[PDB]
């Protein structure tokens, strides 16, 4: 299949540093970390796939964000 | 090496992690430089600790690891100073316990 099915293990190599919420050569974050960008070189099939996977690295994103900003602001305990 | 010439990323993997053990004591490295702004000279620049800056040919998800695990050497140096300043007579027991 491979003469007639283009697209760009290449993904497994810089998947795992966008997973961490880290900017990626292939994959940016923009708008403060509310969205990602899936490049050109990617078709249907891939990019719906990945639509899932990435789901995990912008909502751990999100969370890291919010550790950080509130790590020690809050003075209720229970928060 | 030129930090660009080198493309393979395990390389510049294992480079920057040979710089950046000597980063997080306070040293200066081949790719990982003091900023400009960080003089010596003055006490509350040492005490803050250095602030640095890192080479622009870097691959950019090492660049972001690598500015994170930064800071780390910045608190160290401000420690490391810290000692030799505030560990005398004049500032009394209790900043001298803390020292210790």
């Given at each position: 299949?491979e003469?007639?099915?283009d697209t760009?293990?290449t ?16 994959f940016?974050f ?14 249907n099939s891939f990019?719906?796939?990945l639509?899932e996977?990435f789901?995990?690295?912008?909502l751990?994103?999100q ?7 509130y790590?020690g602001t809050?003075?209720s305990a229970?928060? | 090496?030129?930090?660009?010439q080198?493309?393979?990323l395990?390389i510049?993997?294992?480079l920057?992690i040979r710089?950046?053990?000597f ?9 990982i430089?003091y900023?400009k702004?960080?003089?010596?000279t003055s006490?509350?620049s ?11 040919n870097?691959?950019i998800?090492?660049?972001v690891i690598?500015?994170?695990?930064v800071?780390f050497?910045?608190?160290y140096?401000?420690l490391?100073?810290f000692?030799q300043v505030f560990?005398n ?5 209790i ?5 210790s």
């Amino acid at each position: 299949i491979e003469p007639y099915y283009d697209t760009l293990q290449t993904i497994l190599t810089y998947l795992p540093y966008t997973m961490l919420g880290s900017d990626s050569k292939i994959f940016t974050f923009s708008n403060n970390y509310t969205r990602l960008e899936i490049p050109k070189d990617i078709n249907n099939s891939f990019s719906s796939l990945l639509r899932e996977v990435f789901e995990f690295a912008i909502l751990y994103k999100q969370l890291a964000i919010v550790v950080d900003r509130y790590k020690g602001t809050l003075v209720s305990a229970i928060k | 090496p030129l930090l660009s010439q080198i493309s393979n990323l395990n390389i510049q993997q294992a480079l920057i992690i040979r710089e950046l053990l000597f980063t997080l004591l306070g040293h200066e490295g081949h790719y990982i430089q003091y900023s400009k702004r960080y003089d010596p000279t003055s006490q509350i620049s040492r005490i803050e600790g250095p602030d640095y800056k890192i080479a622009k040919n870097l691959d950019i998800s090492l660049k972001v690891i690598t500015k994170k695990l930064v800071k780390f050497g910045k608190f160290y140096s401000g420690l490391k100073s810290f000692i030799q300043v505030f560990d005398n007579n004049k500032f009394g027991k209790i900043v001298q316990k803390f020292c210790s």
